[PDB]
Paper text:
[name] and [name] form a conserved protein complex responsible for the addition of a 5-carboxymethylaminomethyl (cmnm) group onto the wobble uridine of several transfer RNAs (tRNAs). Within this complex, both proteins collaborate intensively to catalyze a [name] modification reaction that involves glycine as a substrate in addition to three different cofactors, with FAD and NADH binding to [name] and methylenetetrahydrofolate (5,10-CH2-THF) to [name]. [name] is a homodimeric protein of 50–55 kDa subunits, with each protomer composed of three discernable domains: an N-terminal domain required for constitutive dimerization and binding of 5,10-CH2-THF, a helical domain and a Ras-like GTPase domain (G domain) that is inserted in the helical domain. Within the MnmEG complex, [name] is responsible for binding the cofactors FAD and NADH, and it is also the main driver for binding of the [name] substrate.
In the α2β2 complex, the [name] (α2) and [name] (β2) dimers assemble alongside each other in an elongated heterotetramer leaving one [name] and one [name] subunit vacant on each side of the complex. In contrast to all previously solved crystal structures that show [name] as a symmetric homodimer in an “open” conformation with the G domains of each subunit facing but not contacting each other, the GppNHp-bound [name] dimer (α2) within the α2β2 complex adopts a “closed” conformation, where the two G domains contact each other. However, in the α2β2 complex the [name] dimer shows very pronounced differences in conformation between the subunit that is located at the periphery of the α2β2 complex (A subunit) and the subunit contacting [name] (B subunit). The large conformational changes in the B subunit of [name] in the α2β2 complex go hand in hand with a displacement of the swivel helix toward the entrance tunnel that leads to the [name]-bound FAD. However, while previous crystal structures of [name] from [name] (EcMnmG), Chlorobaculum tepidum (CtMnmG), and Aquifex aeolicus (AaMnmG) present [name] as a symmetric homodimer, the subunits (C and D) of [name] within the α2β2 complex are not identical, due to the structuring of flexible regions in subunit C upon interaction with [name]. Interestingly, we also observe very clear density in the EM map corresponding to a bound FAD molecule in subunit C of the [name] dimer, while no such density is present in subunit D. Closer inspection of the structure shows that [name] binds with its α-helical domain on top of the deep FAD-binding pocket of [name], thereby partially closing off this pocket. Moreover, within the complex the side chain amino group of the C-terminal lysine residue (K454) of [name] is located within interaction distance of the C(4)=O carbonyl group of the isoalloxazine moiety of FAD. Interestingly, the distance between the amine group of K454 and the reactive N5 atom of FAD is 5.8 Å, sufficient to allow the presence of a methylene group covalently attached to K454.
Author numbering:
A (entry chain C): 1 to 267, 273 to 629
B (entry chain D): 1 to 255, 292 to 550
C (entry chain B): 1 to 376, 380 to 454
D (entry chain A): 1 to 454
Write the structure that this text describes.
Amino acid sequence: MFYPDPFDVIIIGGGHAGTEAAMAAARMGQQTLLLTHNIDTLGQMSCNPAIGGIGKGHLVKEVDALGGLMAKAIDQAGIQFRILNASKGPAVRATRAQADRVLYRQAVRTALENQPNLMIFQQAVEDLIVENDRVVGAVTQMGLKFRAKAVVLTVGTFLDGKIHIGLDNYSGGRAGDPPSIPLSRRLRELPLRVGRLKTGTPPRIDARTIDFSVLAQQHGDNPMPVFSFMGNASQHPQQVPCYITHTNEKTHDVIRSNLDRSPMYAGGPRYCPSIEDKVMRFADRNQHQIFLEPEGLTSNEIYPNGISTSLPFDVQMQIVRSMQGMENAKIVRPGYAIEYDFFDPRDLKPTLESKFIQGLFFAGQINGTTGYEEAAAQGLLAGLNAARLSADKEGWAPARSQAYLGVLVDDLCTLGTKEPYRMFTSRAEYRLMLREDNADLRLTEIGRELGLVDDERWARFNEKLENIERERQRLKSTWVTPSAEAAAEVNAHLTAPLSREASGEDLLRRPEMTYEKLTTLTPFAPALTDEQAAEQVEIQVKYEGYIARQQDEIEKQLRNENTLLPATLDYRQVSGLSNEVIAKLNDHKPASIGQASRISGVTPAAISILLVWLKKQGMLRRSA
Amino acid sequence: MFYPDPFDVIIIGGGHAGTEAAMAAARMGQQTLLLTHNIDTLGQMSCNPAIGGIGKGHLVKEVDALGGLMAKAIDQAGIQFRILNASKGPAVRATRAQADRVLYRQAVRTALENQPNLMIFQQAVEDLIVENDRVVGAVTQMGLKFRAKAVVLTVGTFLDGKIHIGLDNYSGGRAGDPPSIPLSRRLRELPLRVGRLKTGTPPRIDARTIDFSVLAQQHGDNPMPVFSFMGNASQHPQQVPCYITHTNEKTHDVIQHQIFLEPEGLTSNEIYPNGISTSLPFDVQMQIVRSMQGMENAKIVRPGYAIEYDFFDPRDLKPTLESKFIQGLFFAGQINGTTGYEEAAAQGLLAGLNAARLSADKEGWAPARSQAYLGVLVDDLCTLGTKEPYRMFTSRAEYRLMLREDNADLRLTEIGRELGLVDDERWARFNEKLENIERERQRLKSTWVTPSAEAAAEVNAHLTAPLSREASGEDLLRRPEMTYEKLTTLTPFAPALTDEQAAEQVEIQVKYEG
Amino acid sequence: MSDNDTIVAQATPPGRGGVGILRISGFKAREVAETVLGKLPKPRYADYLPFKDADGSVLDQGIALWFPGPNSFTGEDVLELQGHGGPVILDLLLKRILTIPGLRIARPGEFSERAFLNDKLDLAQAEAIADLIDASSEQAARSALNSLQGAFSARVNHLVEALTHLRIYVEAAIDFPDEEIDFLSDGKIEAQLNDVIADLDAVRAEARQGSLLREGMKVVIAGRPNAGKSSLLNALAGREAAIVTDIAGTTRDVLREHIHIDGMPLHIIDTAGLREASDEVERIGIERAWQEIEQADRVLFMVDGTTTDAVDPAEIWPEFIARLPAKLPITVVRNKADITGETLGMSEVNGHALIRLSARTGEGVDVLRNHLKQSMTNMEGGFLARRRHLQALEQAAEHLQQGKAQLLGAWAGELLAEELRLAQQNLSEITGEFTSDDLLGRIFSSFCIGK
Amino acid sequence: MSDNDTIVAQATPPGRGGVGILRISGFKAREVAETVLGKLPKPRYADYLPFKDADGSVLDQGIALWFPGPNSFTGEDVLELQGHGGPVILDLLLKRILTIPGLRIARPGEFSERAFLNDKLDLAQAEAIADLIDASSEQAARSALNSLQGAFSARVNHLVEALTHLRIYVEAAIDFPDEEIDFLSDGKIEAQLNDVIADLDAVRAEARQGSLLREGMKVVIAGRPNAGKSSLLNALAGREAAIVTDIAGTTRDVLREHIHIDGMPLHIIDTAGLREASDEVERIGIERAWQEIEQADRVLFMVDGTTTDAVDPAEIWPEFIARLPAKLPITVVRNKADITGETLGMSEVNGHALIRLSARTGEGVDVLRNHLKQSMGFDTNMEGGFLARRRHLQALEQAAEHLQQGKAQLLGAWAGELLAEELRLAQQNLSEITGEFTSDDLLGRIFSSFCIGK
């Protein structure tokens, strides 16, 4: 029964967050166990075979800067690379890759198979062990049970999932995988609140039945970019294009005619995920964009992006066979939806620990989210905190001002909506400083403090920081005058010629000028070879004022950030707060006064009364 | 509720029999559909990653001679090749290889996915459409049903199976693969025979916990042998050695036998202990694995287990592998009480051939015991009706000198061209080989020498019973000490045919004319 | 908005008086003292000097007391200014104060907070400090619904909606540059910006004309027709306001009159007699009076002595009592006592005053006045309530000004989104909260983004 | 009241607040200080100390100021006790203070009274104290404060001194009748009188500009029932001032609203549609409306453009033109001009302004506001100025009458004694606002109107 070795942390389910959690915990020098459903599925993409995007590449870059694997498994499994918002400001750009699938799976498995201090095991889990609000040990299916000082669940979408097509259903975690039924009941009994969600995916076409001779093409990019702050472009395999097509009125006619056969309509997020929703919500539009993308460079399956639905198979076939270039097409994998359980993130601390149980952590889909990049960060943070706890040290959690992960966690704790949580750039209030290129500049050091970064990254970061500081100082050490001997060209190709003492630092303050242009000049000598470091000086110079404003704004909320609120607080024992606000706070149970202030329905009067009450009970050392 | 288009032949289950059946049916020139659980598990080996050997090597050669798939994939998924009993005569010679699972699976998937006339659909089936004792299409799990003219069943070990571990078990086709429970229930209506069998696998140790400095290595033969008659040695991947470790008395106590630690991939960290299989619990398995040299402190990644399944004995199908009870439905694969991969690939190929013939409205062909090892296997199984799973051995083929694994092409590829299983490049190479062997044989028989020859001195020196009368090249070669290379290396008997295969064939024919 | 902000607030109650108090407690207390007085007088000394302005004119003359911390009410840099209790002059002085950068107006009962957490106030009265804040906040919220109540609360809705539309079309093509939405990213964006600015001016010019605020505490007198409503209002006003006759429903339009009582302003509202209306005018007037009733502060339900001797307001008109808001204090007036002869005086009925008076002659008039003043009215009456709106709208035009100037350079949309978000954040102090999720919801509902 | 009797009064407005300040002055202040404080703090020192009850129990805590005279608001010993804006406690403290014999709640204006009784400032500056503690517009408040600075007293004193010098010259001439005729005919006296007349006329014109913003003026909206006058007033108000509908006789009661077009006061008065109706209430309303027209400074006419194209006043309704007294400015506004489509703007018919506009749509309200602003004598050209009072205007009129009579007597009868008497009487009338000659009755009546405790 009981295994003869006690581990530090136990991860249950090696999906997209489980792998990150295991990697972080193991690299942080703690014996880690990884219990998984089945192997050879490590790194499987059950939906659109793409990585990155707007709001997702930021999370990927954070995971990389903290020492993750997501950004290193795509440099060797991606067949197309693009940069979104290339013409706009650097703070909003993104990188998106169409990724080969088998290469990604193999890379992830190989990376995770040779990790020191980490052990993997193939088994299911049918229960957990708890006594006195503590979680110690997990039970598998054969009978063997394990003991550990911390547990992390990353079940994803397998907690009693049901596959729906048309008006019929059958049990399934996904297309070809079994359901994790009993653990659903076992977690249900605990003092928790659980609900359900549903989402679908389209079919797969055969790439040798589509007449690509009359379809428009879409290519990648010249000098293609990279994801990790380590690799380069020599690691990418061969690239391939994408094929663009559209729909026509016949497809709309068929969809409307057969709309009766559907779980919805017949007898929901704020956008339109399916295609019948696309048509019904906006019935005047008579054209839609559809993408056909290869799932790899060794497979002849095509993923159609833009045509997800829930209609029966016949309507799927008719919709497929009513588009230019798809006159005679074959389907190898039908579309379908799945419904799965989830937990509301109002009973877990900001460190992704259940506020009620001790040692239990939550990450991935079960946190009411959706997307690959929304699970890797959660898994990384959960594993970091689990290792810190099992080692008997103080945990850690980022703030809304230093990582998109902080925004994600805070919103998932204090939102209360019902849509699956998707990350968007405008969804964060500190966009101007939470960029991509500077992710390491603001995170890697923390990892080195917690032992999440090895020596190669440390040396690279130290060299980059030295380059940045030297460039800043050197640019600060220049000066020009209107009568400068070489000032003729400077005034010629720069508007408003010099009228007094000048300087390159002040020279760049003009918006029209650039960095490389200023470098190409006798004064302001050749720029440094490592342009990755060079771009940082430009960004700093162009965003200094807004950065300073945001910084002094951030420093002022820190006292409310620090002021903590224990989960044992009973707001019914406070005088001067309305009934509705009391109910709201009792339901939410924030962690700090600021997080409560970010709730909707609580005004400054409530926080002032709460502060006065705190000072009366002595539950605060001071509030300054 | 019915697919818009019809089909000619339907194959159920893309296992080891299913891939061969679908490939044969598509090649012969019909429209076929392959129904499989998951596409990403096509070409999966659930046991020892080895192919060929004694008996299990002749079948692969015959399948390749009939234009198959397995040999051309093992040629690229094998990391160690050897010849067993290379000292003995060609009758009992054999070949073996160690397969990289990822490479073999990729090869199988890629080869099978680019076939004309073949369509693959991923939807677990649940029922068959039979009316008036005739087979027309079958229904799936999501409701949709197809219509076709012939069906081949290769369900395998997923029919009402349970996975056992230690002293407990749970239902399932395999470790992590659901079974097709409803499918078996539907077939029970017919008055048939039901049998059961159990199988298991050992654990999979972690390569990072074994000591590889106190163990004896084991390599393969240098001039790497090949399986396919149409291949070469430049297709083989990198070659790696195995390891030898010996048990201890404590193992028998807990329950000398040298054990092999077979690498389970060229880019993996698993190890396959060949000879530790059992149905013991995990504690017993750990204790046993901790009782061998160099494995004092090792961990198990994939715990072992044993499983049972259901099948119908191959006593109710015709020598063409077609259900006697039900027209248009054949039987082939694990569902016919057989194991291994070679034992099932040939059956799948034969079933696909017969199904395509019936669909096109022609006649099938059941191989003979005087011609094919696969025919011998099928005869021994069906005609006997035996419940015992046949295993291919060299012993059961009394016609050893003729039914070698060296001349499967000569006796089967020409026949295959008639049914259409053979292709043009093959046919051309085969005709060239046959012509070369015939020319060399006739030229050898048309040469004569007498003791008066100048080279007669060295001939007598190299030969017992020195020259006495008129002699010919073939008669001289018939001497037991004579060799083809020595015959070539002479003033007479001008340079021999550079085709090594033809030279070996002519040597065998001359020395075994009897 | 750290705990170190220097705030400006008024200590003396709203209304008429000979002295008004403005106190400042924060880091910038010395800054404000130097800005207004142009110098720093002797600490804790009743210095004397007038209030000058930037132009050099004098806004008021009074006594200033500068109290450096910690020996002060809040134990910090606290400035106290004493002048004349004039609402207009007080508003002018407060407007002068607020223009200084980094300053803001205090929230309801903030100084109690500051003087409490600095341990400059005793600790026993936590329960009382928990109410001195809630009552002030509730009264402040109740106010400003008169600030945004006329046509002025019709141009701000336009401004907010226009800004929301602009943000929908400016922020969509930074987050979904892969759909077909035909964004307005071209130069016409700036054109659509201009009108928004041109809209704001309208709002800023809407409150510069119209009524005159007329601070005070509201009062309502109503009842059935011919119940003495006209006579009571005329007697209270001291001059004829509405016709006095026996005709049912003599008055059909609401009337508002202003009266002061020993420095405590109150506003008298006259309404048509409550009853079933058989006329469009009568029904609409009944609706208007009813709506004015809920917004009222103090009410005196008409109780005619001739009609009946019932004293309980619930028994007299249970439906009217039920319709009334709970918090609304209610007073009972037994009209027509001079004919009924019921003794004059103040009496209580079920916790509510029952008063019998002779409206036709003026008997008992003093008693009602005595109760009215004795009834009390914390702060935030009018002039201060509308200062918050004119301030929030003030520090959003400059946001748009400094955001538009960006377009003249390289077209970077992130900075434009930042400035528009800041402007809408400052505007949210008037209408309501507009979170980052509401914009996404509107974008979803407006376009076919989907997936 | 009695100066010797020490007085106490509450200063801050009633209600609740941070500070409720009590102001006490008299000869008992020091004794009352000991009874409530048992100590006399350093004068002009913001001393934090408790307040003592008669029994010795701590009454309250706050800020207590002791201001010995004459360096105080009134020049006597005044104790400024500042506690908290708790009306409940303030009642107890005031009762305790009134308990001590020799203390009494001084009558309103006493604080301004005694400080006036000690010649701290000009008398009219006392009223200047009022009219600023309760104003209506920002411009009015600023002008009232500027007057409180004491500018008007400067002009009054300059005029009185000039009149005194002229009186001295006239008396010197009169004392010598032989050369008195020559002195009068020299021309210096006439020049002095003309310059004084000019300056007095300028000051009276500025005073007329003053008190203009105290109330502004009264405009009456007169027209037939359902002409839209209620709608026009509602548009001018900017709210839902009255009830608007198609029912005849939409309004009966006289409606008064106080607004400010642009930094100016004004009272727009609505009325019932002029028609003969059997309703007694409607007849009374018509009576009231006809009563108010005479009072109003200006009048406008609203007539539907579609009903009749007549623009001349007689054609529209010959009855109203005859009834209304002449000499009153009148304007005609064409309501519902959008249906007529008439060009919108300012027009004059029969020498009177004619305006077209639609109330419901709101078009033409801006031109109406501009006309109201410009027609009434006022503008932003002159700032600071001075704010006056009715009594000031009456005194100025009497002084001007006296000066004119004196000049006429000098020109016609050459009566030196009569001219001197007229000049002295005019000087006394002018000084009446300064309080040197004004009797105590006027001072008391003016001071009584002030709020209690001021």
